[PDB]
A paper describes a structure:
Intimin, an out membrane protein expressed by EHEC and EPEC, is required for intimate attachment to the host cell and formation of the A/E lesions. The intimin of EHEC O157:H7 is of γ-type (designated intimin-γ), whereas that of EPEC is intimin-α.
Crystals of EHEC Int188 and IntN916Y diffract X-rays at 2.8 Å and 2.6 Å, respectively. R-free values were separately refined to 29.6% and 26.8%. These two versions of intimin (Int188 and IntN916Y) were crystallized in space group C2 and P212121, respectively. For the native version, Int188 consists of four molecules in the asymmetric unit while the IntN916Y is present in two molecules per asymmetric unit. Topological analysis suggest that Int188 is composed of sixteen beta-sheets together with four alpha-helices, which can be supported by the crystal structure. Both topological and structural evidence indicate that Int188 can be obviously categorized into two independent domains (Domain I& Domain II). Further structural blast revealed that these two domains correspond to an Ig-like domain and a C-type lectin-like domain, respectively. The Ig-like domain at the N-terminus of Int188 is composed of beta-sheet sandwiches which contain eleven anti-parallel beta-sheets (A, A′, A″, A″′, B, B′, C, D, E, F and G) and ten coils. A C-type lectin-like domain was found to be located at its C-terminus, comprised of two anti-parallel beta-sheets (B, C, D and A, E) spaced by four alpha-helices (I, II, III and IV). C932 in the C-terminal strand E forms a disulfide bond with the C858 in helix I. Strand E and strand A in N-terminus of Domain II form the principal strands of the first sheet. BLAST analysis reveals that although EHEC Int188 is of 48% sequence identity to that of EPEC, the secondary structures of both proteins are similar in the topological characterization.
Author numbering: 752 to 934
Write the structure that this text describes.
Amino acid sequence: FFDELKIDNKVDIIGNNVRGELPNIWLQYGQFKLKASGGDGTYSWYSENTSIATVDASGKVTLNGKGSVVIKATSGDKQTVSYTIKAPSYMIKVDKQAYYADAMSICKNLLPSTQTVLSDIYDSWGAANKYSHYSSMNSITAWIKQTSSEQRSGVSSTYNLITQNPLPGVNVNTPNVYAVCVE
């Protein structure tokens, strides 16, 4: 005989091995295991809006779009338990490689206002290549909105999403630099 079915409040981030509430700042395509308990112990997972996110048979969730969505779990004894996903203050998207100005526009003038905006993601999710969608990369250098003075010097600084290598004085016309957006 079974007892109440639950989905643990604390998610388990795939890329940094940390158990705590779902981060409020999201990297796109980050993923994370949900812990379902109770019932006859046999669980089935379901997203009710893939556009925003996805979940697999084991409960590994993958953030795909910015929004709010309801992942649900159902057991064998026929109980169901929803785990709501809150809209994140911000979510970071990695677009194609482009020069700084060329990028600024791709991201619709929404580049990371500062380095923090990005390092903060690293602390929350970790080395971005510890995820499905990114696996094939050692590095993902990302432009940072340039300070007013950097503007005059045709340069700007950067931060990587895997290596955390903050680099300054980068000419705005240096190739091999992704145009990471922040919506």
